[PDB]
Amino acid sequence: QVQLQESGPGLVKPSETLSVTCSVSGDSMNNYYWTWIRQSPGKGLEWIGYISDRESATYNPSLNSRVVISRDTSKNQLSLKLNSVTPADTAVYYCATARRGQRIYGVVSFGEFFYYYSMDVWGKGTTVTVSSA
Amino acid sequence: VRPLSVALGETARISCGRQALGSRAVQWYQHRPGQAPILLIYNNQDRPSGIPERFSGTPDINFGTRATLTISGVEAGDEADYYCHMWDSRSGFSWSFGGATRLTVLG
Ligand SMILES: *[C]1O[C]([C][O])[C](O[C]2O[C]([C][O])[C](O[C]3O[C]([C]O[C]4O[C]([C][O])[C]([O])[C](O5[C]6O[C]([C][O])[C]([O])[C]([O])[C@]65[O])[C]4[O])[C]([O])[C](O[C]4O[C]([C][O])[C]([O])[C](O[C]5O[C]([C][O])[C]([O])[C]([O])[C]5[O])[C]4[O])[C]3[O])[C]([O])[C]2[N]C([C])=O)[C]([O])[C]1[N]C([C])=O
Ligand SMILES: *[C@@H]1O[C@H](CO)[C@@H](O[C@H]2O[C@H](CO)[C@@H](O)[C@H](O)[C@H]2NC(C)=O)[C@H](O)[C@H]1NC(C)=O
């Protein structure tokens, strides 16, 4: 069993840094991927990025790469920081874990396969608001 | 967001709009308003976690068939949004979750 908790300020002035922390208890960072996902009212879900033990911060190309995700094993948690926030970015954030699989359809020595990811465990997520007042 | 209505006791069938070109591996996500999404089917052939044996998907055999999720014996609690995450071989990495559908209950 794995337990995941989240934390965030909630009230940030526009055009600053928005940092949200996600901690894990019960298991270590042995073979557990991590990912973040935001959801804004009026629109569907939006996958923003994922990270693992490879320090390969791959981001969504439709996001301008204005967010950085880090994970420190000493405190046993990760955190994402989005710079230059926009007041129209009010959305609920979720920290989840990812499981990677491979689908094979031909000869493996030629490279006829492709990887995919599936999120099995989710979280409650934080609802943050940004405004000038 | 396309709406679709289902009556009690009937069998519901939900299909996502995106059509695959080659080998497919879809994921069906159920998201209730206010709660975290629940994974139902991950490899388009089997349910990921233990759930009531009511949700079934179509396997990937004899390419040319669509992707549909069927729910037999629907109750009032089956009121949530359904996401069809599509993964094929001739499109690369898929970032968008696709257009979700809105299931409504009669009664
Ligand atoms: C030459 O030579 C070569 C070499 O030898 C060959 O190649 C071959 O080829 C083939 C063709 O295609 C191929 O295939 C493929 O395969 C695969 C594999 O897989 C996998 O994974 C899984 C998971 O884990 C497992 O389970 C399996 O396993 C199996 O089975 C087998 C038998 O078959 C056995 O042996 C083993 O042990 C086991 O048990 C594996 O591992 C597969 O998968 C595929 O399949 C496909 O497609 C089809 C259509 O056609 C379909 O139907 C199927 O399905 C389905 O189901 C599945 C199950 O899993 C799932 O997943 C999915 O999603 C669906 O649902 C599939 O998809 C195929 O079969 C191979 O790979 C190869 N090999 C190598 C090494 O590379 C060739 O062919 C030759 N040529 C001539 C002869 O001409
Ligand atoms: C190669 O592609 C063709 C094109 O679809 C496949 O064939 C056809 O067979 C189907 C099965 O009865 C029919 O529903 C299609 O109408 C028919 N295509 C046409 C243009 O009439 C064929 O099965 C494929 N080959 C393999 C090995 O799957």
- Whether chain B has a CB inside 8 Å of the CB on A43: the answer is no
Record: contact B31-A45, CB cut-off 8 A: yes
CB A24 within 8 A of CB A123: no
CB A37 within 8 A of CB A48: yes
Starting from the CA of residue B58, give the closest ligand: 1
Pocket test for ligand 1, best of A99, A102, A103, A104 (most atoms within 8 A of CB): A104
Report residue B14: phi and psi, to 5°. -120, 130
CATH number, domain of B21, equals 2.60.40.10
Q: Per the structure block, which two tokens stand in for B73? A: 């014996």
* B27 → closest Cβ in A45, A62, A118: A118
Residue A88, helix vs strand vs coil = helix
Ligand 2 mean position to B57 CA, how many Å?
Answer: 23
Q: Per the structure block, which two tokens stand in for A95? A: 């920290």
Tell me the domain boundaries of chain A. Answer: 3-130
The CB density around residue A94, as the number of other CB atoms within 10 Å, is 23
Note down the domain range covering B92: 2-105
**Contacting residues for A92 by C-beta, under 8 A, at least 6 apart:** A38, A39, A40, A125, A126, A127, A128
Record: contact B97-A94, CB cut-off 8 A: no
- Whether chain A has a CB inside 8 Å of the CB on B5: the answer is no
Q: Measure the CA–CA gap between B92 and B76, rounded to whole angstroms.
A: 38
- Whether chain A has a CB inside 8 Å of the CB on B44: the answer is no
Closest CA to A126 of A91, A95, A86, A93: A93
Residue A8 CA neighbour count, 13 Å, CB half:
25
- Whether chain B has a CB inside 8 Å of the CB on A62: the answer is yes
Q: How many domains does chain B have?
A: 1
**Contacting residues for A133 by C-beta, under 8 A, at least 6 apart:** none
Which CATH number is A3-130's, of 3.40.50.300, 3.30.300.30, 2.60.40.10, 2.30.30.30? 2.60.40.10
Q: Can you give the C-alpha Rg of chain A in angstroms?
A: 16
Determine which residue's CA is closest to atom 11 belonging to ligand 1: A106
Q: Measure the CA–CA gap between A70 and A82, rounded to whole angstroms.
A: 12
Residue B74, helix vs strand vs coil = coil
Chains A, B: CB contacts under 8 A, how many? 45
Q: Per the structure block, which two tokens stand in for B99? A: 């257009």
Give the torsion sign (CA, A85, A91, A92, A93): negative
Pocket of ligand 1 from Cβ distances under 6 Å: A 104-108; B 25, 43-45, 59-61
CB A28 within 8 A of CB A76: yes
